Amino acid sequence: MKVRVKAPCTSANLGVGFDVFGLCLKEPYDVIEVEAIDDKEIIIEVDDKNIPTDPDKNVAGIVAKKMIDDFNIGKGVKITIKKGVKAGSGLGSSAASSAGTAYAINELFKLNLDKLKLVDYASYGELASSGAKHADNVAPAIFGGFTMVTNYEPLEVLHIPIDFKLDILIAIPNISINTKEAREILPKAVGLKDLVNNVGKACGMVYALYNKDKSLFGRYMMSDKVIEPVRGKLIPNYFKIKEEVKDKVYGITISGSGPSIIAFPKEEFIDEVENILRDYYENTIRTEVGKGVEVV
Template sequence: MKKVKVCSPGTSANLGPGYDIFGLALSNPYDIVEVEKTENGITISVEGEKAEEIPTNVDENTAGVVAKKMIQDFKIESGIHIHIIKGIKPGSGLGSSSASCAGIAFALNELFELKLSKLELVKYSSLGEAVAAGAPHADNVAPAIFGGFTLTTSYEPLEVLHIPVDLEVLVALPNIQVSTKTAREILPKEIPIKDMVNNVGKSAGMVYALYNNDLDLFGRYMSKDCVVEPCRANLIDGYSEVKEKVKDMVYGITISGSGPAIITIPKKEHVIDIENIFKEVWNCPVYYTKVGPGCYVEEIE
């Protein structure tokens, strides 16, 4: 095996009250990560969405950080060239950096037959997130590896729970710049006990709703975060207006990750109406997609 080409999905984290815990893999958008064996060293090239803004220095690139650590840990003597085709806009709130991190970990596991478990791949993938978010987080890389709906329930030790789900989502991507670091810094350092009870209760209810295929309950609870969303809503012009306009057309609506992407669980008969509202307010790309699988191999040479 000389080269592997991997599809790595976009993801939506938090899903309202599940801050830093819940994650959802999306069928669209996605990145393509190609890794080819070379004589020595690690080189990186990037094309696609905002490619010109993505560093190709190994220590500054999220995929490069993951690759460097895996090559060191497994004493891989071959060099590699990483080519990333960005289909997920960086800074979108749709797991752009996570897709690169997960894609490279998955690709190296295949290319060098490392036989790592999905949980081990999540551990390596999360190292690259420190470049983008300032600390290693698994809420986006977990669904990028596992697919479906994931819960990162512990970091020491790392624990990820996985629930396969069949769910359609409608995502808007406003042309608004939201810094992941800023989106984390504005969050409260302490919260009232009643807010903690609300979010724990709503999160538990969302899991219950998945097992009972109750879209109404899942979406209603997804929309009831009282800790993170109220802070981040101020970073996205028009969000409160849109949330009010579509409230009867969706089962649920919330900010995807740190934003600016907005994720909804739409009522099928209103999909076009919701799209029109998104475009009227933001004139932005809209993805009508579904929950998808984690990383998978597209091609091997």
């Protein structure tokens, strides 16, 4: 009959973890309901008028069709989506719809697929919306916590639960940034030295999570000199904001391909950091690490 889920926004890259790291947020999230229908068609309703309802264009339809065909399911589905945040915000909006749909289809048709497989299916949605089957936003959307996409073909995802408090502040600019473009402006090659820096800093972030060291995690997160300095120039006041909250956060960086900004405020300055972000971007939210798609 029907399955309804909340599918969370996620923050990919986290600086030196470009195309690998992902952190699941508790909010915002999409509320997605999938209902099996007799007609073998996929019908989509979405509250954001800028998101297509064509099932071959909305990632929810792309993922549902792939799963329905792969399991010879003989039904269609009506998918209703209420968006947590607009597309192109750097908060994994489309990944929320892809992952929420994969999860919902799995439940609705009792496919008993494991999390890795759900991420793999959701990534077919990311293929379409970004032109690349990247799984770094759909992985945390499904697994919750912190994930690392460590291989493709075949997809491998390593998950590290965050079992300690990690306050998150997200500033969401009203402008949007197209991920494909955000990737084209990136260097085609990086110096051996950046390879070494990013590998060391990203490994240090993994060590930091196992040691529950927010300070180390946040500081290493801000050491990327390859991607973040580039995308950061697309975001109004981004560098000014970083300087203004400098000693009041464990770290702050671009969420995904931007323009949203993700900050991990120190407990002592959370209200103040939130007020600073809000002065620049009215749409600022306080959240924490989420647990992934779940029924609602």
